[PDB]
Ligand binder design. Structure first.
Ligand SMILES: *[B@@]1([O])O[C][C]([C][O])O1
Length: 261
């Protein structure tokens, strides 16, 4: 199609490897570019950790209010929110919001611990039918994004389907689903990524990711005014270990997708 030719041209212009999956929930149509190739998830994995904890809270009704101590030893490389509560506590709700809306790495590690390790996050993915997602490491090493390394990867197709199920489907309870959507809509890190390629009138909930090899990711649910919502995943990685982020590539991919509607 035209869209796939334009995405291929964008990729060629960028010097990297681009993965895109769009699900149009109107007719359940899909648009895929390298849809079944593995990409490093980096912080887009935080959606799965938060959702797994939300799933736990369906049975443990008070779980999200559980206080969790933030100790200096817990701090890793990027802890914008956890830093504000060292030697204090954050609830699991506050940690989930920090992981999602600020991409706090300490928060992510506390969510992983709550789930019994990376295998507990992966287990949740399997439980909702995602056979592709794999979380192998904690923060910060899950962002190494080494070419060919299958650790901490998924495919665009798999992530799109899973994000659809978590936000628009019923993989989560009604209150949990609404909470996740609210959190994603309140993301603070996404202004230059998918959001920047879309009409300003559309409502977006997204989770960005960045890592080594210039890995620049964004996964989003999109609510166009007067139109069925869309799920869009954009993954991008580069051949140089110290490559710079390229959020403009994700904005451009979103713009190309939006034009084709
Ligand atoms: B994710 O990718 O978003 C930011 C942090 C930086 O380590 O991880």
């Amino acid at each position: 199609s035209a869209v796939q030719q334009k995405l291929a041209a964008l990729e060629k212009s960028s010097g990297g490897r681009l993965g895109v999956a769009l699900i149009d929930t109107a007719d359940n149509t899909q648009v895929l570019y390298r849809g079944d190739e593995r990409f490093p998830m980096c912080s887009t994995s935080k959606v799965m950790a938060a959702a797994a904890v939300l799933k736990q809270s369906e049975t443990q009704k008070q779980l999200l209010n559980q206080p969790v101590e933030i100790k200096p030893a817990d701090l890793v490389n990027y802890n914008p929110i956890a830093e504000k509560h060292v030697n204090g506590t954050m609830t699991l709700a506050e940690l989930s919001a920090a992981a999602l809306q600020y991409s706090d790495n300490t928060a992510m590690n506390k969510l992983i611990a709550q789930l019994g390790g990376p295998g507990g996050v992966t287990a949740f993915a399997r439980a909702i039918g995602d056979e592709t997602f794999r979380l192998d490491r904690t923060e910060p090493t899950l962002n190494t994004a080494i070419p060919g390394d299958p650790r901490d990867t998924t495919t665009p197709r798999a992530m799109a389907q899973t994000l659809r199920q978590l936000t628009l489907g019923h993989a989560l309870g009604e209150t949990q689903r609404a909470q996740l959507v609210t959190w994603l809509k309140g993301n603070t890190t996404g202004a230059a990524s998918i959001r920047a390629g879309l009409p300003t009138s559309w409502t977006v909930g997204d989770k960005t990711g960045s890592g080594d090899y210039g890995t620049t990711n964004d996964i989003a649910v999109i609510w166009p005014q007067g139109r069925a919502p869309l799920v869009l995943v954009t993954y991008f990685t580069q051949p140089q270990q110290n490559a710079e982020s390229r959020r403009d590539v994700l904005a451009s991919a979103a713009r190309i997708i939006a034009e084709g509607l």
